[PDB]
Amino acid sequence: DDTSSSINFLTRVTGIGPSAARKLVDEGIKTLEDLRKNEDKLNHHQRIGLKYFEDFEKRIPREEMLQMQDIVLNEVKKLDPEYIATVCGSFRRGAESSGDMDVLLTHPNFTSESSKQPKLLHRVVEQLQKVRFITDTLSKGETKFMGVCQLPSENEYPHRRIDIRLIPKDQYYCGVLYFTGSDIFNKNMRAHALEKGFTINEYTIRPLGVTGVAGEPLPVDSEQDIFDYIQWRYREPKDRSE
The annotated binding site for a 2'-deoxyribonucleoside 5'-triphosphate is made up of 59, 90, 93, 99-100
Distance between CA atoms of residues 24 and 43, nearest Å: 12
Binding residues for Na(+): 11, 13, 16
Q: How far is the CB of 91 from Mn ion (least distance, A)?
A: 11
Span of 71-79, 95-103, 151-159, 170-178 interacting with Mn ion by CB under 5 A:
95-103
Of 86, 103, 163, 240, the residue at the interface with Mn ion (CB under 5 A) is 163
Q: Is the dihedral of CA 82, 87, 92, 94 positive or negative?
A: negative
Task: Please state the separation of Cα 4 from the chain's center in Å.
Answer: 30
170 binds Mn ion (CB under 5 A): no
Binding residues for Mg(2+): 100, 102, 163
223 binds Mn ion (CB under 5 A): no
Q: How many CB atoms lie within 10 A of CB 46?
A: 22
Q: Tell me which H or E stretch contains 138.
A: strand 134-140
Query: Which alpha helices (DSSP H) does the chain contain, by range?
Result: 4-10, 18-26, 32-36, 44-56, 62-79, 89-92, 118-131, 172-180, 183-195, 223-229
Q: How far is the CB of 100 from Mn ion (least distance, A)?
A: 5
Comparison of 89 and 168: residue with beta carbon closer to Mn ion: 89
Q: How far is the CB of 131 from Mn ion (least distance, A)?
A: 21
| Residue 111: HSE in the Cβ half-sphere, 13 Å Cα cutoff | 7
Binding mask 100-139 for Mn ion (x = CB under 5 A): x-x-------------------------------------
Q: How far is the CB of 182 from Mn ion (least distance, A)?
A: 14
164 binds Mn ion (CB under 5 A): no
Q: Is the dihedral of CA 185, 186, 188, 193 positive or negative?
A: positive
Comparison of 29 and 101: residue with beta carbon closer to Mn ion: 101
Closest CA to 124 of 83, 161, 159: 83
Q: Are 106 and 166 in contact (CB under 8 A)?
A: yes
Binding residues for K(+): 11, 13, 16
- Contact positions toward Mn ion, by CB under 5 A? 100, 102, 163
